[PDB]
Every structure is written in C-alpha cells, then in structure tokens.
Structure 1
C-alpha cells in the first residue's frame, strides 16, 4: 500500500463544500459526516445552505471522496486516491445529461488537519428549464453502479468513464454520462493503477427533523476487478 493509506485506517470526519451555478441558478451545499475506508463506508448529511436546491439531489451524488473506497488487500497497490493524501487530488468531471445540459465540476480533495475535505465548484449549462433536472422530475433514489478506472500515466493520474441512470418519476431513466480525471495536488509519488472498477451502492434518505433542503446519504464503495 501507499503511505497515504495509513491516514484512512480509522473513522475520518468529512467536510464537503460545494458552490454551484446551473443555468444561472446559484446554490451552495455543505456536507458533514465520516468515512471508514476499511468498510468502504460513507455516512453524510448534505444541506443546501442557500435555500431550495435548483436541481435534484440525486444528480449531485457523484460530485458530492473516493479515497474512502475499500480496496481489497490484494488490490491496495491500485488505490490512487489514498496515495495522493494528505496533499490531495483534483477531480474534474463532465457530467452530460442525455437530452439535457451538462455539469462541469472541479473538486479538491485533501486533508485539513484530521478532516477529509471535498471542496467543489459545479457549473451547469444548457439545461432545459422544464427538463428532468431543472424541472425536478427525478425520483429520490439511487441505483448501484460501477466506476471504471484506468491510469493516465502521462498525467500522473487516473481517468474514469461511467454512466449513471437516474429514475424519472414517469418510470423512464435519465442518463448522466460521466467523464472524470483525477490528478495529484502534491509532488509525492502516487499509485497509478491497473484497470479496475469501483462498485458503489447509495441509499438516500431524509432527516425527519430537518426543515432545510437536504440529503442523508449512506454509501458503500468497494474496488474490484483485479
């Protein structure tokens, strides 16, 4: 394993801070919780601190800390994310909603003292004002998915490509194509993995005593494929 892996052997508090602008609809989200990478386990609560979230919460799940994935011992030389810690990594995505707009996101994931922090900027353009996203037509749930990871040695990082299918309230599906790049922030060596994937399962819920717009998320992420 990497030196950074040692930072994740116990429960680590997590902070997420997102500033977004989708078709000019601005919003911010704050999340708090903890991760226990030994179990690939994340428990987080996200709050829209600016009022109503102008997109569906499920569309932000992939943007809202892959360093908490459980890498099987036989695969730990393939865990880029922890290997970049504590200096961190920059995750860049384009998320293309079929027949609608796209998000572009830039996230910096790094330790601030003992807290793993994910700071994100999200920009969404070319959405339909009464499409599935800005019209809030997506169910509040989330299917299991695989994230396929490949090295990008020339960039000293990794890439991923994957499809998320959000459930539309009419029974159909809203595809969100994801293209992702992750690059280290610091200078230290990182682990550049062989091809593999992350298997993710996510449960979305609500805090019955919370009046703000929010999402409670229980998520498990486990590496596989090698």
Structure 2
C-alpha cells in the first residue's frame, strides 16, 4: 500500500460515557506501521470537569494498521487504505460491567484520523474500573478469523489490578474495510503488548502488535 509509510501520524477523538459519566478524549501520536508500533498522548475531559472517575484501561484498547505482518499472511488492515477501516467491539467484564465501542479510521496525507463512540454500563460502584484500581492490560494473543470479506477478533483480556491479581474481560471485535479487500487472509493470531503511563487526565500509550501463525 503506497500510502502506508514507515512513519505515520495519528489524531484521535472519542465521545464516551461510562456509568453515566460523559467525557471526550482527544490526542495524537506517531507510529511505525511495518513494525506494529504506536505511541500517543491522550487527554480526557469529563463533561462535569475534574479527574476521570474510572480506570483509563477501560478505553486504552480503543489501530490495526499498526501490526507487524509477515509476508505469508495478507495484511487486511493496511490493504484497507486509503479507503478506510472501521471496527466494532463488545466488552464483557467478569463482574458484570460491559461496554460497546466502535471507531472509524480515515487517512489524509500520512495522518490517520481515528473517531470513536464508547458506552460503558453496569460497572459495580466498588469494582476496579470505577475505583480506578486497574493499572494495565496484560499482553495477549487475539484470534483472527475471516468471513464475508470482514475479520473477526476474539481475545480473553486480563486487567492487572493495583495490589496484584487480575480481572477478566472478553473482547469480541469485527473489523471492516471500507472497500472490498483484494487479498483476504486466513485464520491467524495477533499478539499485543499495550502499556499505559498516566498522570491525571493525561495518558500516554504504547502498543506493539505482531501477526503470526
């Protein structure tokens, strides 16, 4: 894909709500698509102002073109450009909390414009999410399958808790190219390593993802 460069930029915008707490997130980053690497800075603004009342991990997983793909596996995500890529995801936490989020990724120049909508519900008031007690997502391996020109992702995620221990969350994702992809990939995996560094309502993220098998 001619428009996918070794170095790309990103601009983000999210309209969100968790347990009724409305907020928006805006930020920017840089990445190396062929190395499956991305880094960024994100700023959260609560509708009512003040510090965000939930753990940032709830939204940190909200950019597949940044995945290192081996030559033997067709890269659905890079092939999706410049036309565009969209995705939809459901989250099911072990304590009953859940969320739905979708995003559209467009490309202009060498800058990806990432726009998302996030709604989280039924989180226990004393749970790790609303108590801001999670610290990171554990590295993972997501199963990618193909069907009807689109991809599906399934991965069991684990939140690392502040004092130790984990909290399970199941991700169910559908990835959709804006235009029919020339070369569809077969079933495979994508291993991720998403890490955050937070200071108040400002969070920096780094993700390294590699496709395999």
Tell me the TM-score normalized by structure 1: 0.86
Deviation per residue, 1:51-97 (Å, 9 max, x gap) = 4223211221211x11111111222xx21111111121220000111
Aligned counterpart, 1:145: 140
> Any idea what SS the aligned residue of 1:94 has?
strand
CA contact (8 A) 1:200 1:222 kept: yes
Aligned counterpart, 1:215: 203
Aligned counterpart, 2:11: 15
Selected match of 1:107 from 100, 103, 106? 103
* Structure with higher helix content: 1
Aligned counterpart, 1:85: 81
Selected match of 1:203 from 162, 186, 195? 195
Q: Judging changes above 3 Å, is the alpha-carbon distance between structure 1 residues 117 and 191 closer, same or farther for their aligned structure 2 residues?
A: farther
Aligned counterpart, 1:224: 212
How far apart in 1 are the matches of 2:194 and 2:156?
A: 15
Listed as ranges, the gaps of 5+ residues in structure 1 are none
**2:182 maps to 1:183:** no
* Structure with higher strand content: 2
Listed as ranges, the gaps of 5+ residues in structure 2 are none
1:104, distance to aligned residue in structure 2 (A): 0.2
> Any idea what SS the aligned residue of 1:132 has?
coil
Aligned counterpart, 2:54: 55
- When the two chains are superposed, the root-mean-square deviation of aligned CA atoms in Å is 1.7
Matches within 5 A, 1:122-141: 122-138=118-134, 140-141=135-136
How far apart in 1 are the matches of 2:53 and 2:156?
A: 22
